[PDB]
Design a protein around this ligand. Structure first.
Ligand SMILES: CCCCCCCCCCCCCCCCCC(=O)OC[C@H](CO[C@@H]1O[C@H](CO[C@H]2O[C@H](CO)[C@H](O)[C@H](O)[C@H]2O)[C@H](O)[C@H](O)[C@H]1O)OC(=O)CCCCCCCCCCCCCCCCC
Ligand SMILES: CCCCCCCCCCCCCCCCCC(=O)OC[C@H](CO[C@@H]1O[C@H](CO[C@H]2O[C@H](CO)[C@H](O)[C@H](O)[C@H]2O)[C@H](O)[C@H](O)[C@H]1O)OC(=O)CCCCCCCCCCCCCCCCC
Ligand code: CLA
Ligand code: CLA
Ligand code: CLA
Ligand code: CLA
Ligand code: CLA
Ligand SMILES: CC1=C(/C=C/C(C)=C/C=C/C(C)=C/C=C/C=C(C)/C=C/C=C(C)/C=C/C2=C(C)CCCC2(C)C)C(C)(C)CCC1
Ligand SMILES: CC1=C(/C=C/C(C)=C/C=C/C(C)=C/C=C/C=C(C)/C=C/C=C(C)/C=C/C2=C(C)CCCC2(C)C)C(C)(C)CCC1
Ligand SMILES: CC1=C(/C=C/C(C)=C/C=C/C(C)=C/C=C/C=C(C)/C=C/C=C(C)/C=C/C2=C(C)CCCC2(C)C)C(C)(C)CCC1
Ligand SMILES: CCCCCCCCCCCCO[C@@H]1O[C@H](CO)[C@@H](O[C@H]2O[C@H](CO)[C@@H](O)[C@H](O)[C@H]2O)[C@H](O)[C@H]1O
Ligand SMILES: CCCCCCCS[C@@H]1O[C@H](CO)[C@@H](O)[C@H](O)[C@H]1O
Ligand SMILES: [Ca+2]
Ligand SMILES: [Cl-]
Ligand SMILES: [Cl-]
Ligand SMILES: [Fe+2]
Lengths: 38, 137, 81, 334, 451, 342
């Protein structure tokens, strides 16, 4: 169970960080029209 | 069917004297009972102890008898267990314990008579619904 | 448009209101009196608050026969004293 | 273009057969976890003590259920609102007895479906669309939160969440009616207008558009071949449809503007289901339906029954029979 | 008629307030006039509550939601929450009512009389949504205002009478808080608690030392952050993540308000410390626990040994073990064993409910309190018939906790929808396609087919 | 020939504010009388002699609890004509005996026929295909099965639905307790048709509104549409790509999409109607025999199916004496099914 818990804790943190860094990676500019939104 | 003086005539004491209530008294009794008592006694049952109800037959067999105006008025001043052996003002609203049951603070003698009258008249109206519980809703 | 006068035309005309400031309250009052005189009770056979039961009875006056249903009801109505 | 930039371009790429996106990064693992656990538990899960009284209810196909009676059974009343992951149990056998799988499924599902809503916003932004399709989906999504999360919080137990099964759904609905008189609640009533109305306007708009298709085909071919995917011109005559529907009622009860017509088609069922979800969500805090029990009284004081009192008789039968071994004290206060 | 029709502004009448987006003078008025309405309701509703208030009924039998707020701050109440002086309630109402006239006056002036734009009038009061510097400065001023507000609760708690403490030894009383919790391990520890059963995240705060100390931190944090935001301008990583427009800032606030509304819903439902049950009525968990207490007391008086009474399921009829062994009330209330309240805790020992205290130490005031709370469970109908859905008419009651929880769930839900609406539009407007697809530049037509 | 029939035809088909037609001769009196009778009855008429119920504003009921209730069970399936052998021409007795219920139900039936004939008549004059009238067959199938076939299978009109809000709620609950109607797969198909219909309604309307072409400069996009314009007002191509990528599949044919929107709720209502035709005969999907055989022999076997039958048994025993007064059910307290404590 302890190994399971750390495994899940690690998997969740991995995916959550992708989400956060993904939306921090210039997302407003990722559209087909105006690409200067700063 | 209507609320006649016969409906509103109830036992005043145990010696057999009756008293006839006005429709005003009866309706005041209903409002005051809703104010001070229905949270536990809605419909003539007792939510915190369903073994005891407010049916007239149950009140007649209490000690002392509670099936008349004087018995019920005394009960609102100094309530006792069903056998009369113990005084329960500390756990049951009463004039004697109006300091810990503040809703009893603004009840007058005339109010206690009206509440008593409502308790005695209502079974004459509702029959088994009074004190019967959910089975008779 | 299908030829009838527009509704916004009519209900902002003085003559519409001269007529309907009378006829609307008049019907309203006729409906009031239909209840207040007790006439609605007797037209439709609806019990008044003191007419659902006899003083001691607790039974419903339920119709139980098809072809004497009319007499059953008239009988129930007598038994109200 | 470094590796992180390459990854971001693939995640947000509009050329993937199914759009991934950043919401997709959370959606895909959580929905797969919930789906795999649901399928396995529906087939093979042992009976679950839903009400905490050591009275296990059988939900899975292998333990005597068919498609109609089977369910994933809500987690134990003894757990209440405590978090019960696999690693809080001493064994998988304990976890299963206590309804662990229910918690794992609904928490993963609710996250996934919330990200599904976000993903609807996200692809519309990548395609240069207007953004509000995801607002339409908030009505079914809010509804799922109501019966899987909000109602358990207010009543204090996931054991009162909706079961994951067909007959379990009916159980939840009947007990809900006994404990909140939802049929007499105006928010459920608006929900019924929402879905009856939605179904009415669905058939209506379908019949009207279909009734005014421009002749492009012969009797031997399906009329659907008269529309070509991507063609510039409209495929039905909306002036004809309005000319018909306006005479069916009267002219000013009919839409001639396709934009406002289609907005109405969106708004009516979505608003109605929002209210239905708010019904469950506020009855979750015991603000119940209208109570007219013994409201009509005659001159003496006899109760004159109404249809509301007949409803109450049926509610009492549900109340006194539900969870027949679970109550020791006279009032069912949650 | 500047931007007061659809042709000139682009906005139909049903979206008419969107015509204010770039008219800071009239937008100022609309905000001040609306604040007047809020302050108006606060004062007027308080006076209405006071006029309809009987001192000797419980507050929660009277449909009161604002007098309970005033009473929790220590005003008008004595031991046990008994009302001793209704004049504080009167003052709070009158002063809010009077102030609303001042705000209404300024709102109506700026809205229809004053300059429609402030930028040509004043460079301090004028602003550009696109000006990240000015926006964080206006933000900074208001963070400082908010932080003073939290320090005022502390000043009341520590220097001006104190707060009502439902946990005070004796039965509950106003108490001056002299040692508020300052240890950041405690204060921010609440932020890291799980929100699930038995933990409750910040809803679980259960003593005024923690409440007061948490507001000291919040006060400093807001004041500190407001200076930071006056003195700084958003960094590049922040510049690239946000939309910088008026509708965007509105959408961020709407998301924040939704989250607060949901938290507030749970606070009033579970917490009986900053929402004392003396004033708000028992929580749902509380009343359910109180029923088991009541019948354990009744039956033990009749001679039952409640510790060994086996119920129909095999679980104890009155007492049982929680999944981690604690002794807890039996029956369906097994779900509510995380409940804590001042009338129940004296029966609690290290292992939970303590059988020797149950047999020997139950005082009549606990029997009274349990019977009161069991008969004021937060259950009732929409027309305020108290009780279960099958109960008959008689008792006019719906708990204040149900009114407050349901209203704010509904409001929080619609503010989440508002967030989605306005954030989606803000994104589309900034990118330039909120009015529709350009026929001669439709993005999908320049993309390869999926198959 | 321009005889009286053709002259009358002309006048009946004048393009006026409210079209009349030949169908209007049937539709308008019957629709007006059905509505007026419901309004008359819920305002003034009791259900004391048929049901033991107050049911009108005059008695103190509100919008949720008024009804025009069904006649007494002793009336059987009588037409209850005003001039019939029960009322014998007496308007007051007729109301007290439930005559308004047959009045409403019968004129309602013929009014619905009239409304569907109107859809045919107007479609023929304007030159459109009659798919709207075809879709309206589903409401008619529902009305006929629930309000006419179902009680004709039963003992009497008494058990048809009464015309009122709370009265219909009681009907829903009666069908759960006595018929286990949630278990019926014909009802299930109806539920799918209705919920799927609402889904299609929301998703089509939302999709159109969010793939609009920018055909104007205003922020209110409603103005940028012209009923006679030739071009589509939203992008089917973008709509198709979005849904393909969100959901996997998408519509590509606009004619199929709108036919499907007709098909789903219409078919659902037809399916539910067939189920009710079965309940007319008590031909229920009440039980799974395999479940009952196992549960009878194995007192540890429990499913949501056995849990729901316990609820139905409670509904039957607790509502039946008041809901079926002509039966004179006297159930002493000791026989009522109850769990522990409640
Ligand atoms: C940016 C955001 C990004 C997303 C973040 C996602 C992070 C994870 C998800 C968080 C939500 C998890 C679910 C929590 C469920 C719950 O049990 O929440 C309950 C808790 C309260 O916990 C309770 O708190 C109680 C504290 O009371 C204790 O302390 C008191 C002190 O007086 C009393 O003494 C009381 O008797 C005593 O028990 C006890 O611990 C209880 O056992 C415990 O259950 O609320 C709380 O923590 C605070 C309120 C939680 C928010 C409410 C969620 C509702 C969301 C609705 C969304 C709908 C939208 C639809 C979309 C369309
Ligand atoms: C498509 C949609 C188009 C739009 C709809 C158009 C609207 C038209 C409206 C027409 C209204 C029809 C009225 C039918 C009334 C009826 O039926 O009244 C019923 C009577 C029979 O009377 C009943 O008879 C029953 C049995 O009695 C018999 O048995 C008794 C006990 O054994 C005694 O012996 C008794 O003497 C004997 O008569 C009971 O007595 C009942 O109380 C009594 O109501 O039949 C009769 O009048 C006639 C019976 C023969 C004709 C049946 C055709 C019509 C019915 C079609 C539906 C059938 C579905 C069946 C269930 C599925
Ligand atoms: C909190 C609610 C609220 C507030 C504060 C505002 C405020 C405003 N609206 Mg908005 N609006 C609202 C709700 C609100 N609105 C709603 C619900 C709708 C839907 C109908 C609209 C639809 C709408 C449209 C279509 C337009 C506005 C416009 C405006 C602005 C100019 C109004 C004007 O010039 O009228 C002049 C009106 C009068 C001269 C009549 C009387 C107005 C006064 C203020 C009433 C005061 C009464 C009060 C008792 C006085 C107390 C004084 C006392 C304290 C001394 C103003 C800032 C306009 C705008 O944006 O302009 C750029 C505009 O075109 N609104
Ligand atoms: C503080 C919060 C806030 C603010 C400042 C705004 C501001 C705005 N909104 Mg947003 N909105 C919000 C919250 C907010 N909204 C929420 C919570 C939702 C979800 C429902 C929305 C959903 C929304 C939509 C769908 C739209 C806007 C739009 C707008 C713009 C035009 C609004 C207008 O003139 O309405 C005029 C006001 C009315 C027409 C009044 C509506 C009356 C309501 C529905 C009745 C509510 C009943 C009441 C509560 C109880 C009954 C009372 C009765 C018995 C007397 C304006 C910028 C428009 C826009 O996009 O512009 C860019 C637009 O289309 N908003
Ligand atoms: C925080 C909001 C809030 C809460 C929790 C309460 C709670 C309460 N109020 Mg108060 N009140 C409020 C705001 C609130 N009120 C406001 C804004 C006003 C001015 C109108 C009042 C004026 C007022 C008076 C005059 C009285 C109360 C009373 C009460 C008590 C009884 C309530 C009742 O019976 O409702 C009945 C239930 C309803 C009316 C249901 C309303 C349904 C609404 C219209 C649905 C709307 C949904 C949503 C907003 C619209 C979304 C649209 C969508 C398209 C986006 C209860 C404690 C009574 C009391 O006991 O005082 C001591 C009383 O007499 N209130
Ligand atoms: C927070 C909302 C707010 C904001 C941002 C403004 C901003 C402005 N006002 Mg407006 N106004 C407001 C509310 C507001 N006012 C209110 C409530 C009223 C009614 C009293 C007015 C009545 C008003 C008039 C009649 C005029 C203005 C004018 C102005 C402009 C010049 C102000 C100045 O330089 O005075 C200098 C600054 C001061 C004198 C400091 C005042 C300090 C106050 C009075 C003491 C209390 C402040 C403290 C925070 C109290 C907290 C109360 C709060 C908790 C409710 C400026 C754009 C002028 C204008 O538009 O010119 C064309 C103008 O003629 N205002
Ligand atoms: C009204 C409140 C408020 C608002 C709207 C802002 C707004 C802003 N702040 Mg400011 N700030 C504030 C108060 C506020 N601040 C206060 C009180 C302080 C003192 C503590 C600061 C100290 C501060 C610093 C040092 C900085 C900002 C910065 C900013 C900008 C970037 C925001 C951002 O990216 O957040 C996004 C949030 C994150 C990236 C961290 C959250 C991590 C994830 C999302 C998990 C958390 C979610 C979880 C569910 C929360 C639950 C509770 C939690 C405790 C567990 C933005 C303009 C940045 C800036 O540009 O300065 C010029 C910056 O560097 N702020
Ligand atoms: C802008 C605008 C708007 C809005 C407005 C508003 C929102 C306003 C507000 C306003 C306000 C907000 C106002 C207020 C006022 C107040 C007042 C005026 C008060 C007074 C008071 C008094 C007088 C008092 C008295 C008393 C006393 C002192 C004692 C006790 C008793 C009594 C109560 C008697 C609208 C929408 C219309 C639209 C157009 C534009
Ligand atoms: C007073 C008090 C207290 C305290 C409190 C505190 C201390 C609090 C704090 C709090 C806090 C400290 C909070 C925070 C929050 C945060 C948040 C809420 C965040 C958010 C974020 C976001 C939302 C982001 C987003 C994004 C992403 C994620 C990606 C990129 C882009 C963006 C930006 C969009 C206590 C309890 C002791 C007691 C009672 C009283
Ligand atoms: C039966 C019968 C008949 C017939 C009669 C009729 C035809 C009647 C009609 C009647 C009518 C024709 C009535 C009406 C009534 C109406 C009413 C009574 C109304 C009310 C309304 C209201 C109350 C409203 C409400 C509302 C809504 C709904 C929504 C919006 C808002 C409001 C709140 C406004 C005859 C003689 C042939 C023969 C014998 C039998
Ligand atoms: C619990 C959550 C903790 C979150 C901590 C947040 C701290 C914020 C500090 C700033 C971090 C942002 O770091 C972010 O990362 C990536 C590289 O990895 C950068 O690089 C990005 O550049 C541009 C931005 O338009 C994108 O086109 C490109 O795809 C991407 O590589 C972002 O420009 C940078 O802003
Ligand atoms: C019902 C239809 C019966 C048509 S009847 C028909 O009506 C004509 C007038 O239009 C006459 O000229 C003709 O003589 C007559 O038979
Ligand atoms: Ca700054
Ligand atoms: Cl059950
Ligand atoms: Cl229990
Ligand atoms: Fe369409």
């Amino acid at each position: 169970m302890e190994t399971l818990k750390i495994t899940v804790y690690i998997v969740v943190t991995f995916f959550v960080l992708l989400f956060v860094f993904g939306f921090l990676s210039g997302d407003p500019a990722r559209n087909p029209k105006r690409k200067d939104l700063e | 069917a209507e609320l006649t003086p016969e409906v509103l005539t109830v036992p005043l004491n145990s010696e057999g004297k009756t008293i006839t209530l006005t429709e005003k008294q009866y309706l005041e009794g209903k409002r005051l009972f809703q104010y001070a008592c229905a949270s536990c006694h809605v419909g003539g049952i007792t939510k915190t102890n369903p073994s005891l109800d407010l049916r007239t037959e149950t009140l007649a067999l209490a000690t002392p008898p509670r099936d008349n105006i004087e018995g019920l008025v005394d009960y609102m001043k100094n309530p006792t267990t069903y056998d009369g052996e113990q005084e329960i003002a500390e756990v049951h609203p009463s004039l004697r314990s109006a300091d810990i049951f503040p809703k009893m603070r603004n009840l007058t003698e005339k109010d206690l008579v009206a509440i008593a009258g409502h308790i005695l008249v209502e079974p004459k109206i509702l029959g088994d619904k009074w004190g019967g519980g959910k089975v008779y809703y | 448009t299908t030829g009838e006068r527009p509704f916004s035309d009519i209900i902002t005309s003085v003559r519409y209101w001269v007529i309907h400031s009378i006829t609307i309250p008049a019907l309203f009052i006729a409906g009031w009196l239909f209840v207040s005189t007790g006439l609605a009770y007797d037209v439709f056979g609806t019990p008044r608050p003191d007419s659902y039961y006899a003083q001691e009875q607790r039974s419903i006056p339920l119709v139980t026969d098809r072809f004497e249903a009319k007499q059953q009801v008239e009988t129930f109505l007598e038994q109200l004293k | 273009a470094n590796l992180w930039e390459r990854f971001c371009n693939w995640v947000t790429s509009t050329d993937n057969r199914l759009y991934v996106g950043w919401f997709g990064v959370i959606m895909i693992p959580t929905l797969l976890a919930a789906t795999i656990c649901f399928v396995i538990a529906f087939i093979a899960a042992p009976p679950v003590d839903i009400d905490g009284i050591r009275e296990p209810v059988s939900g899975s196909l292998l333990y005597g259920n068919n498609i109609i009676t089977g369910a994933v059974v809500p987690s134990s009343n003894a757990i209440g609102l405590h978090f019960y992951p696999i690693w809080e149990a001493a064994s998988l056998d304990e976890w299963l007895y206590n309804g662990g799988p229910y918690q794992l499924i609904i928490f993963h599902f609710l996250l996934g479906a919330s990200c599904y809503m976000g993903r609807q916003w996200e692809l519309s932004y990548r395609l240069g669309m207007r953004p509000w399709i995801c607002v339409a989906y908030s009505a079914p999504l809010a509804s799922a939160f109501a019966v899987f999360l909000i109602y358990p919080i207010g009543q204090g137990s996931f054991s009162d969440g909706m079961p994951l099964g067909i007959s379990g759904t009916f159980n939840f609905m009947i007990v809900f009616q006994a404990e909140h008189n939802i049929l007499m609640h105006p928010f459920h009533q608006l929900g019924v207008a929402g879905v009856f109305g939605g179904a009415l306007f669905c058939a209506m708009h379908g019949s009207l558009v279909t009734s005014s298709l421009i002749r492009e085909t012969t009797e031997t071919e399906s009329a659907n071949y008269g529309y070509k995917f991507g063609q510039e011109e409209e495929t039905y005559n909306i002036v004809a449809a309005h000319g018909y529907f306006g005479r069916l009622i009267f002219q000013y009860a009919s839409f001639n503007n396709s934009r406002s017509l289609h907005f109405f088609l969106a708004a009516w069922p979505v608003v109605g289901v929002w209210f239905a979800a708010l019904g469950i969500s506020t009855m979750a805090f015991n603000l119940n339906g209208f109570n007219f029990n013994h409201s009509v009284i005659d001159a003496k004081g006899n109760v004159i029954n109404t249809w509301a009192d007949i409803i109450n008789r049926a509610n009492l039968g549900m109340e006194v029979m539900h969870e027949r071994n679970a109550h020791n004290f006279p009032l069912d206060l949650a | 008629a500047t931007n007061r029709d659809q042709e000139s502004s682009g906005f139909a009448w049903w979206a008419g307030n969107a015509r204010l987006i770039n008219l800071s003078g009239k937008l100022l008025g609309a905000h001040v006039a609306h604040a007047g309405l809020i302050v108006f309701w606060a004062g007027a509703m308080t006076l209405f509550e006071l006029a309809h208030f009987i001192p000797e009924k419980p507050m929660y039998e009277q449909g009161l939601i604002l007098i309970p707020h005033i009473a929790t701050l220590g005003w008008g109440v004595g031991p046990g929450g008994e009302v001793v002086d209704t004049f504080p309630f009167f003052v709070v109402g009158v002063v809010h009512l009077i102030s609303s006239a001042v705000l209404g006056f300024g709102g109506v002036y700026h809205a229809i009389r004053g300059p429609e734009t402030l930028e040509e009038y004043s460079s301090f009061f004028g602003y550009d949504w696109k000006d990240k510097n000015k926006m964080t400065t206006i933000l900074g001023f208001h963070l400082i205002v908010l932080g003073i507000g939290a320090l005022l609760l502390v000043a009341k708690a520590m220097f001006f009478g104190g707060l009502y403490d439902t946990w005070a030894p004796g039965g509950g009383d106003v108490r001056v808080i002299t040692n508020p919790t300052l240890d950041p391990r405690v204060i921010f520890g609440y932020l890291l608690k799980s929100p699930f059963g038995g933990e409750g995240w910040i809803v679980s705060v259960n003593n005024l030392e923690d409440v007061v100390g948490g507001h000291i931190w919040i006060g400093l944090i807001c004041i500190a952050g407001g200076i930071w935001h006056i003195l700084t301008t958003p960094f590049g990583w922040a510049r690239r993540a946000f939309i910088w427009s008026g509708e965007a800032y509105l959408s961020y606030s709407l998301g924040a308000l939704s989250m607060m509304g949901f938290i507030a819903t749970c606070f009033v439902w579970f917490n009986n410390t900053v929402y004392p049950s003396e004033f708000y009525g028992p929580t749902g968990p509380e009343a359910s626990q109180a029923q088991a207490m009541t019948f354990l007391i009744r039956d033990q008086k009749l001679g039952a040994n409640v510790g060994s009474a086996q119920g129909p399921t095999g679980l104890g009829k009155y007492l049982m073990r929680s999944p981690t062994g604690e002794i807890i009330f039996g029956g369906e209330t097994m779900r509510f064993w995380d409940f804590r309240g001042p009338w129940l805790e004296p029966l609690r020992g290290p292992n939970g409910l303590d059988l020797n205290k149950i047999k020997n130490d139950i005082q009549p005031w606990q029997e009274r309190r349990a019977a009161e709370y069991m008969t004021h469970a937060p259950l009732g109908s929409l027309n305020s018939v108290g009780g279960v859905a099958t109960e008959i008419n008689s008792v006019n009651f719906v708990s204040p906790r149900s009114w407050l929880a349901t209203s704010h769930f509904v409001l929080a839900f619609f503010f989440l929808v508002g967030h989605l609406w306005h954030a989606g539009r803000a994104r589309a407007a900034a990118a330039g396609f909120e009015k529709g697809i350009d026929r001669e530049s439709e993005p999908v037509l320049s993309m390869p087919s999926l198959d | 020939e321009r005889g009286w029939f053709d002259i009358l035809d002309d006048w009946l088909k004048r393009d006026r504010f409210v079209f009349v037609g030949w169908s209007g001769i049937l539709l308008f009196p019957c629709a007006y009388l059905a509505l007026g009778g419901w309004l008359t009855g819920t305002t003034f008429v009791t259900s004391w002699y048929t049901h033991g119920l107050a049911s009108s504003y005059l008695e103190g009921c509100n919008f949720l609890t008024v009804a025009v209730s069904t006649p007494a069970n002793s009336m059987g399936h009588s037409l209850l004509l005003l001039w019939g052998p029960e009322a014998q021409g007496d308007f007051t007795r007729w109301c007290q005996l439930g005559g308004l219920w047959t009045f409403i139900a019968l004129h309602g039936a013929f009014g619905l026929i009239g409304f569907m004939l109107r859809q045919f008549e107007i479609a023929r004059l304007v030159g459109v295909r009659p798919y709207n009238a075809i879709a309206f067959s589903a409401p008619i199938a529902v009305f006929v099965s629930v309000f006419l076939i179902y009680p004709l299978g039963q003992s009497s009109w008494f058990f048809a639905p009464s015309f009122g809000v709370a009265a219909i709620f009681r009907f829903l609950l009666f069908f759960q307790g006595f018929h286990n109607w949630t278990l019926n797969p014909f009802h299930m198909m109806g539920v799918a048709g209705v919920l799927g219909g609402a889904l299609l309604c929301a998703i089509h309307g939302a999709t159109v509104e969010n793939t609009l072409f920018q055909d104007g400069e205003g922020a209110s996009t409603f103005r940028a549409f012209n009923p006679t314009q030739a071009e589509e007002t939203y992008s089917m191509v973008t709509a198709n790509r979005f849904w393909s990528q969100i959901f996997g599949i998408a519509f590509s044919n606009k004619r199929w999409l709108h036919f499907f929107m007709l098909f789903v709720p219409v078919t659902g209502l037809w399916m539910s109607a067939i189920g009710v035709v079965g309940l007319a005969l008590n031909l229920r999907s009440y039980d799974f025999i395999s479940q009952e055989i196992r549960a009878a022999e194995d007192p540890e076997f429990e499913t949501f199916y056995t849990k729901n039958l316990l609820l139905n048994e409670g509904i039957r025993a607790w509502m039946a004496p008041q809901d079926q007064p002509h039966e004179n059910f006297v159930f002493p307290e000791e026989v009522l099914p109850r769990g522990n404590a409640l």
